[PDB]
Write a protein that binds this DNA or RNA. Sequence first.
DNA 1: GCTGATCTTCAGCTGGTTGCTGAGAGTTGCAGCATTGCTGAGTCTTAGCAATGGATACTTCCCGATTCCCCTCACAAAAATAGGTCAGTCTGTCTGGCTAGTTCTGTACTTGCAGACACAGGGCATGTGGGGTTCCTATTT
DNA 2: AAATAGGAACCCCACATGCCCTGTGTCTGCAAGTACAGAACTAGCCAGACAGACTGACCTATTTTTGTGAGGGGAATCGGGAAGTATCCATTGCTAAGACTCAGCAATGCTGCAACTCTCAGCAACCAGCTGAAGATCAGC
Lengths: 226, 226, 81, 82, 89, 96, 98, 94, 94, 107, 108
Amino acid sequence: EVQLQQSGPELVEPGTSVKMPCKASGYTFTSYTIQWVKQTPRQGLEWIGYIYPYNAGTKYNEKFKGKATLTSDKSSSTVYMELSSLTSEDSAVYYCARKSSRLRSTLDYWGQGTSVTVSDIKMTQSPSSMHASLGERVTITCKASQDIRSYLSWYQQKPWKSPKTLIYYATSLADGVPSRFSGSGSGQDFSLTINNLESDDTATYYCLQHGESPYTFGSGTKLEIK
Amino acid sequence: EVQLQQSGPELVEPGTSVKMPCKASGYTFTSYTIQWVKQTPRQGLEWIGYIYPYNAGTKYNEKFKGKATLTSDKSSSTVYMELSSLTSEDSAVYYCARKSSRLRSTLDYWGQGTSVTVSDIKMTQSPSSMHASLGERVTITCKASQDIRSYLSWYQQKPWKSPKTLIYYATSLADGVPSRFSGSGSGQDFSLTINNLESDDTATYYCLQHGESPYTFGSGTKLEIK
Amino acid sequence: VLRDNIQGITKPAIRRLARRGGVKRISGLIYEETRGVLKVFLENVIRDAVTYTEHAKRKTVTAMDVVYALKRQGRTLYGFG
Amino acid sequence: KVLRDNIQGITKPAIRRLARRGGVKRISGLIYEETRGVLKVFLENVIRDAVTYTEHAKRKTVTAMDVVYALKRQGRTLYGFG
Amino acid sequence: KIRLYQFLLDLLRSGDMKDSIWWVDKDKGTFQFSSKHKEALAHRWGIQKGNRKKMTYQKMARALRNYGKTGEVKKVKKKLTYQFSGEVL
Amino acid sequence: PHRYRPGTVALREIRRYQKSTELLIRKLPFQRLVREIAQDFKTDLRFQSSAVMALQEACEAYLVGLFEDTNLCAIHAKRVTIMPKDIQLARRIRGE
Amino acid sequence: KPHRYRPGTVALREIRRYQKSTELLIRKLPFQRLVREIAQDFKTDLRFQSSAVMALQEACEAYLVGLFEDTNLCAIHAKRVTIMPKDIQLARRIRGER
Amino acid sequence: RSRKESYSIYVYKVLKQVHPDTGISSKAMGIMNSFVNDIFERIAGEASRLAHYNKRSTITSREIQTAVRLLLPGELAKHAVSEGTKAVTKYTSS
Amino acid sequence: RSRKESYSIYVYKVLKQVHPDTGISSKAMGIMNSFVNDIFERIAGEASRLAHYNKRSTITSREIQTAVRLLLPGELAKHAVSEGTKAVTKYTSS
Amino acid sequence: AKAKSRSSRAGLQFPVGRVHRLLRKGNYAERVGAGAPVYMAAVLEYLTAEILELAGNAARDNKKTRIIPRHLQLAIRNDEELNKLLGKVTIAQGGVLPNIQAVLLPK
Amino acid sequence: AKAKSRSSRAGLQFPVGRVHRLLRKGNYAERVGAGAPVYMAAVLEYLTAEILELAGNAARDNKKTRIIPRHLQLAIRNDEELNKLLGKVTIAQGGVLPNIQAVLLPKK
DNA sequence: GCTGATCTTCAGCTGGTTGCTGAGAGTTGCAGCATTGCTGAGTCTTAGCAATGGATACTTCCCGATTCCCCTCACAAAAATAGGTCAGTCTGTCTGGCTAGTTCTGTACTTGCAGACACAGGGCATGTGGGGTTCCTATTT
DNA sequence: AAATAGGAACCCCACATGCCCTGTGTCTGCAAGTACAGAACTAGCCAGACAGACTGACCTATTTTTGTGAGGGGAATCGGGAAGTATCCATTGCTAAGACTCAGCAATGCTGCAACTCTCAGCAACCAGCTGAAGATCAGC
């Protein structure tokens, strides 16, 4: 039901400006903030900022201040992001994700990703990459720098695909997620566990914190099956 | 608190038209209909009509249609009555009285009376006039033509004064009237009893029915004390 | 499965509703806005009513449930119980 | 004692301040009397309900909780007084 | 109840709307309907009874024929005329 | 041929529909719309006929009141044509 | 020539100031006198707690401020910037108070 | 098959008492049923709140009178209070 | 001395749980007290109405959950339902 | 002794006993006073009588035999006190009051 | 046996026992279930926690270490769900949100 | 249109203070624990009705194209009015004290309401009938 | 062609009947609420200074109102087709009644500890003063 449409890839020469939409449908548009996340092979997922369509309120990452500008259009339920002075290190995929204004909530639904190519709290994931057979147990550790009161979420990202939410609030199962995935931990130590494995489970898992103003992701964990 | 102000006496030659105000204060103006009553020495009191300021609804006596028209001015809390084609047989005192929209209510408060001079159900008040000393019982009867489900009121009018309400709903005491006054009866026969008389109680007593569309007063009753 | 049924509230029907409301002239863009507001109102009332039926472990929405939903949205309805 | 002609105590600058808090930029000269009337009506309603609540309790002092009840009764819930 | 002949008696006794139904012999109780205003009389009967459909003089007259069994209203051989019985007079 | 000047037929319609009481939306489209809306919450639902009737009557009353407020807003702006902006202003002031 | 501000900017300054503070904008004593006078017509020799008068004042300020926001919306709808009594009447009618 | 227990017969008695000749339809009957239920709920709930505020455990005619005063507007409250007082006075004398 | 019996201490415990170094003023304390009382009254009254509608005489966690669904908007209802279910599940295990 | 309804004792048409039972089983108070059902039954009867009389007058003014919901709506909406009491109430088959703004009317 | 508060058993900070007493004495039902006060306390605690966290964040962004009614108003009115829940609620000394209509601002 | 100088306001920093918040001592009232019983709620089975689905024929309305008229909107003038300054004035506010009228607390007790039980009549679900009503055809003036 | 008969369903409003369950009558127990007395407490009134908010005049700018006129948006019309509707029948499924059972909740008494009140120390916030940046305003080239 909930869906966040996005435009296709755009080729832009450096020094210009670009804008992409995040047309959202299937829910009360003004009740959910739209968060923008960029993903690069050398930095992984990176939080840019959000906009609250209810009161046009915004909040930007310090390292993306000025570079990105977020606007909302209540009539068409669309949110735009503008990048000014496109520098060479901007060829990445920009995601727009839905997140409720509730602190416990996380980025639940994501856009497909617009591959744009141009011409704090440190969140540490202990296992960089791991292997497992068809039915073993895996566990991913996500030790944090500072203390976050269980404001941690786990995401699964298939290759060339938008990430999918698994755990929010460090223990709560997300919608549609089978009980095989189980989160645990609080404070600074968090863990994600998968009891029964399948060929689907071959993906990269990220842990995201939203306890403090600059949201930070983990390095990720490439999990391979057989 | 509740006051219904009127204008002074009018000296008007025959054939013209006159309008008099009924500026009201002390209550919610739109909640009470303003009723207009004319008084001639040879026909007593006659009901002209009423205006409901809530929706400007009118209802005139069949013998006064066309001759009188009622207008409501909500901004100034004033009601005007316009009399057109002033015949010689129009020299009378015109009273404006407040009556609630509730069927049980009656004309509770009256204006001072605008003396204008130009250069069906029948009420039977059996005892025309009586003489009594300072302490006896007196009974007035208001035998009706048709039946009225206790929709009868008793009014006291001192000479050269506006009528004062005593009994409404044929049994209920009005506001501020001493318990000496007592009304009784229902259907077609109604009674008014005065417990102990005083030199003040000498006045004219009328019985008004409002059980049917044309309101009709009684013939009157002159009470003399000692 | 039912789809696009908000188009069933035709333009003449909306004009009739406006006429009952005393509207003399109607702009061409009124109809889509009216369809949107009607859809929002209906979604709210139906959600409350379905909650009421689900609590009673029923699978049929009764007139009592709709009346209760309207009452709890401050829209008391007379004549259905 | 007897109080008389106190709605005039809601002066013009007070109404201007209230309008400014509402984001009003320009105010017509006839707004003040209309605002005084509206405030008088609102106060009459709330005070009548509060006095009824106090009367039922066989008290002679209008407590703040009576005002809270009167406001709550009119869909005007007030926080911070009980 | 039986209010139909009560209606037919009341307006004749009160002299109301003589253009449709009127007297020639009050002693025996005979009366004559107008061939033109009898539709108005039937309609005024129907509005009082507050039925669903406006009734014609045919449906009005259909009722009088059941009165012959009881004897209040009977039809004699004379165009547009009936009469009450002595008891209901 | 004869043609009524604009606004006369509209005034006749206003007088006519303010005098009657039947539902101004056909029953079948509204039933379909209600079932479609309820499909989102619970699948394989069921509706009493009186339930759909109550829903329709509530919707008619709400829309008629909203259109009265919209007409008042339009008259406030020295117009006789209601526009979406008047609906929005009325809904905003009502608190919706 | 003394310095003069063009009309409109001082109004915006006042809007910014009074939308940032929370104190009562009506003098306490005149409001209390008004409340006592209004209550005189419902019961003689009444008594008011200070917190009661304060709660009444808080309610009145909130109500008037909300009504003024609605009035401003109505005035802007009519392509104006000056609120007039007709805007107040329209807002109160739509709200259901009239 | 559970004896629905409406208000129809009492409303019909009142109607025949106040307008001996006019009837009433089923839809209007149900509407007046709903009206009586709604007013009952309003007055009873407000009287319950009144008893709760004053730390009383019983609802008396005083509570109902105050609820009527608080809920009905204008002369409606005055006439309803008169009717209730008269009924209670008559009932007390048995 | 009358033992007003407010919610102040529990709200302070919650505040110290979420914001360890942040205090709260007396006026804000009273406002949050009023908020808690208002929400409790709303949910309890609506649950009582739900129990009455289904001819039940008891208020269970099901009535409270349905009330929470009915009066809280959006994700507030979802998270309140999750919290209540977690608390009841933990309490049942004693 | 001979059974006597409390309604008859109070001289009312509405059921005092049923109102008492509804008060007792309605979760309103721990106890219910003796005169409370009588008082509230009298109030309900008064309101019913007033509305029914107004609706009957409206029906007679339309020359109709029976009160239909339209007449009830006309009775309530034409009375300001009754309109205030039933401001947020929708009446089935009620329609609306006939009202046209003066601006829409032609010159 | 040593007395254990029902709040501690349910892992709560709000009083389960007091909530149960208020439910029983509040004229809501003939009887109250065992888990009803636990559920009620959990919901109340969640709501107060959410409002308090938002108000504390608002105070911190204002460089204050004490929540005042203004911070509560800022927390509520800036959240659409909380504003909808408390739409008809007045907060004393809470002020109003800073909002100026666009057309009132100077053009150039 | 594009800055530039001048004046005003707002934002930030630092020291004195001050009233307001948090924590500790005393205590007391209510939550928790342990029984006891009994009834309201859960479970099964099935009667009974109402909702759903399809068909058919008839009625009612809806949709798109045309014409044109009058309403809305852009625009300029006028003429009405509100806002900004300022000198003068008046009133709110703060301080504290004194009643004294009102509210709160404790006792004795009394009066009215809940509980239990027998039972009978009121109210609900059907039903039966008078006085028409309706509908279509045929017959006799 | 108008008037009259008449068979045959049918509708509205009483009126009757069977029955069953719930409201009434009666008695008993006991606690909710009341009358009274005394303590305490807090709201109304007094009073004086004083500083800052309020008020009325004046001038001007800037906002609203009024009078144009054009044009394209919506109303009025119409005719064919598309749904809507009424009714009729069959199916099915789902809601509640009735019986049975027992687990959870009320009621009760005792106790201990958590929550209330009262207090006071100390510190976050407030105020005053000062300074620097931002922005409004009036020429000017």
